[PDB]
């Protein structure tokens, strides 16, 4: 029974930092990239789409353009690792990793973004 | 590549009525149940978990128990098709059909529920 697992449901992130949120999936022996699909999104806005070896950007949101990448190395360890650079308050919310690999599942991750007044005022207006 | 499509992404349903919301996915010749996974949910509540031929009857969310089922005959046609009976105001919201079949994709469907005053409470 194919189960995606998350070591951390919740990340607390400082504005301007970078984060890597992780989804684990079973890999017996060596990853077959041709059978792997990974979607990452937040609030039905798309971040990563990894179909049989390559990312696509085809339904990606601009807010994440040039800021998000999936660590390909980690896939062969069974780790779907999403790195977001230069975290913005807009990045707070609920992420989903959807994984299809001879079986399919998905998990939610909640991200909380702390920021000081200057950053928060800009976001507010 | 593999695309789930929704001809109709908006349903307007009457309280107490029935609805059938549909997602299409391509089938080449004969359907292969072993490769097929169909998952249906609404704003993070499980409705249908159909894995390699078998509906998992015991994982359905309580508020949908005995009201929701996947029309298995429609899969042979490349139509997921979630049939919901005795529609409640709680049924309004965004549904998702997630489909894996030699490829994977998902789509959103919005449901609105019309209801008379008495039903609308609810509300308390
Ligand atoms: C969300 O639940 C499930 N969802 C399933 O289907 C999800 C699904 C189905 C079809 C396609 C996709 C998909 C995959 C990649 C990209 C796009 C869609 C997904 C995530 C199947 C079984 C389950 C139940 N497994 C529970 C195991 N988790 C535990 C024990 O923690």
Numbering used by the authors:
A (entry chain C): 18 to 142
B (entry chain D): 18 to 141
Give sentences from the paper.
The small-molecule PD-1/PD-L1 inhibitors of Bristol-Myers Squibb are based on the (2-methyl-3-biphenylyl)methanol scaffold.
Having confirmed the affinity of BMS-202 towards PD-L1 and its ability to dissociate the PD-1/PD-L1 interaction, we crystallized the compound in the complex with the target protein. The obtained crystals diffracted to the 2.2 Å resolution. Four protein molecules found in the asymmetric unit are organized into two dimers with one inhibitor molecule located at the interface of each dimer (i.e. the stoichiometry of the BMS-202 : PD-L1 in the complex is 1: 2, respectively). The 2-methylbiphenyl core of the inhibitor anchors at the very bottom of the pocket. The distal phenyl ring within the biphenyl creates a T-stacking interaction with the sidechain of ATyr56 and is further stabilized by π-alkyl interactions with the sidechains of AMet115 and BAla121. The methoxy-pyridine moiety provides a significant contribution to the compound binding including π-π stacking with the ring of BTyr56 and a number of polar interactions with the A monomer including the carbonyl-π interaction with the backbone of AAla121, the anion-π interaction with the sidechain of AAsp122, a water-mediated lone-pair-π interaction with the backbone of APhe19 and the water-mediated interactions of the methoxyl group with the sidechains of AAsp122 and ALys124 and the backbone carbonyl of ATyr123.
